[PDB]
Structure 1
Amino acid sequence: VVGGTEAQRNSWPSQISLQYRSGSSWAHTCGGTLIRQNWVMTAAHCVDRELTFRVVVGEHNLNQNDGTEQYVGVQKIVVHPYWNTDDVAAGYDIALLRLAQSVTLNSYVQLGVLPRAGTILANNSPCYITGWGLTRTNGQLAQTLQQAYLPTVDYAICSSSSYWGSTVKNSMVCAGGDGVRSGCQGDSGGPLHCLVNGQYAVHGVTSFVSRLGCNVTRKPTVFTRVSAYISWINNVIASN
């Protein structure tokens, strides 16, 4: 997250760190949202590589003991069947991870609330991106979970020529684009949390930014629109 602030420890308890085994250690690679005690929602592109993955829930600082973490292996990966790794712009950037164990819920570990199917946010709706991704274009991962306030940019504006044009689909949510704050590498797969009727819900799964950089004016961060995938999500969980 570029232009973020440090999240309070208990603000976003559905945020997870998706990590891969790297020698004798583990490396953060993406975010995710805990949606059942044994299922995480993330981006398909996060799991294209043939790596060994684990999830950390109750994580705040990637590099220090928080006293709240639970570490769990990924048992099964279900990518959206229409995902194509060479065409992120086509959409379908979503995947579900079945965890080897069911995690325990508490003030640091909670299920993310998902929007009702079909819900589209009005232009300029209040949302926060969260993650441990790069804090500058071509920078380094954050140590502590970051948040940034990124208002939505509706499909009409986002798909206009000076924004993303044809690259953005109605199965996506755009947010931000102010040139100061944005998602960045390592935020992929994580939540976009939007306040609706007094409650935050996870409306987006972080998918991409501009090849030119993270915080680029009129290139808002682009997310998979969760409310487009509610039936798919339910179908996977019910058959697995």
Structure 2
Amino acid sequence: VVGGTEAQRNSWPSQISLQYRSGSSWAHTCGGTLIRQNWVMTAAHCVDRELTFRVVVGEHNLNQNNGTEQYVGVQKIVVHPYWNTDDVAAGYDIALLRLAQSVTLNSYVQLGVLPRAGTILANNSPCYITGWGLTRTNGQLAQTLQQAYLPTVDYAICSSSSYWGSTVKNSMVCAGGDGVRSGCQGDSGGPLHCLVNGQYAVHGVTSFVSRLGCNVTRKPTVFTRVSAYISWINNVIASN
């Protein structure tokens, strides 16, 4: 997250860190949202590589013991049938990970609330992006969970010429674009939390930023629109 502030430990308890086995250690590669005690929602592009993945819930500082972490293996990966690695602009950048065990919920580990199917946010809706991604374009990962206030940019504005044009689809949410705050590499797969009727719900899965940089004016961070995939999410969990 570029232009973020450090999150309080208990603010975003559905946030997970998706990590892959790297030599003798584990390395953070993406965020995700815990949606059931044994299911995580993330971006399909985070699991394109055939790596050994694990999920950490109750995580705050990647590099220090917090006393709250639970570590669990990924047993099954279900990417969207229509995801195409060579075409992120087509959308469908979403995957569901079934965990090897059910995690224990507490004030640090909670399920993410999903929006009702088809819900579209009004322009400039209040949302926050969270993650341990790069804190500068071509920088390094954050140690502690960052958050940035990223208001939505509705589809009509975001698909105009001066913003993303034809690259953004109506199956996506745009947020930010002020040149100062944004998602960045390593935030991919994570939540966009938006306040709706007094409750935060996860309306986006972080998908992509500009090839030119993370925080680029009029190139808002682009998210998979979760409310476009509620039937698919529920059909996958009910059979696995």
Using the size of structure 2 for normalisation, the TM-score is: 1.00
SS at match of 1:210: coil
Query: How far is the alpha carbon of 1:239 from its aligned partner?
Result: 0.9
Pairwise CA distance, 1:41: 0.1
Counterpart CA distance in 1 for 2:111 and 2:156 is: 32
Instruction: Give the CA deviation at 1:49.
Output: 0.1
Residue 71 (structure 1) aligns with: 71
Instruction: Measure, in 2, the Cα distance between the counterparts of 1:181 and 1:117.
Output: 28
SS in 1 for 2:12: coil
Deviation at 1:50, TM superposition (A): 0.6
Structure 1 position 202, deviation (Å): 0.1
Q: What is the distance in 2 between the residues matched to 1:6 and 1:72?
A: 25
Residue 31 of structure 1, CA deviation: 0.1
Q: What is the deviation of 1:84?
A: 0.1
Q: How far 1:207 sits from its partner (Å)? A: 0.1
Q: How far is the alpha carbon of 1:199 from its aligned partner?
A: 0.2
Rounded Cα–Cα distance in structure 2 between residues aligned with 1:214 and 1:169: 19
After TM superposition, give the deviation of residue 62 of structure 1 in Å: 0.2
Offset from partner CA, 1:85-113 (integer Å, 9 cap, x none): 00000000000000000000000000000
Residue 128 (structure 1) shift: 0.1
- How far is 1:237 from its partner? 0.2
CA deviation after TM superposition for structure 1 residue 71, in Å: 0.1
Q: Which runs of 5+ in 1 are unaligned?
A: none
Give me the whole-angstrom Cα distance separating, in 2, the residues matched to 1:76 and 1:61. 27
**Corresponding residue SS for 2:236:** helix
Q: What is the percentage of aligned positions where both structures have the same residue? A: 100
Deviations 1:8-55 (A, max 9, x none): 000000000000000000000000000000000000000000100000
Cα distance between partner residues in 1 of 2:185 and 2:220:
14
> For the residues of structure 1 that align with 2:226 and 2:10, how far apart are their CA atoms?
23
Whole-angstrom CA distance in 2 between matches of 1:13 and 1:75: 22
Match of 1:97 in 2: 97
3-state SS of paired residue (1:231):
helix
Number of residue equivalences = 240
The CA deviation at 1:180 is 0.0
1:56 Cα deviation from its structure 2 partner:
0.1
The offset of 1:220, in angstroms, is: 0.1
Q: C-alpha separation between the residues in 2 aligned to 1:13 and 1:164?
A: 31
Cα deviations by residue, 1:132-179 (Å, 9 ceiling, x for unpaired): 000000000000000000000000000000000000000000000000
5+ unaligned residues in a row in structure 2: which ranges? none
What is the distance in 2 between the residues matched to 1:196 and 1:157? Answer: 21
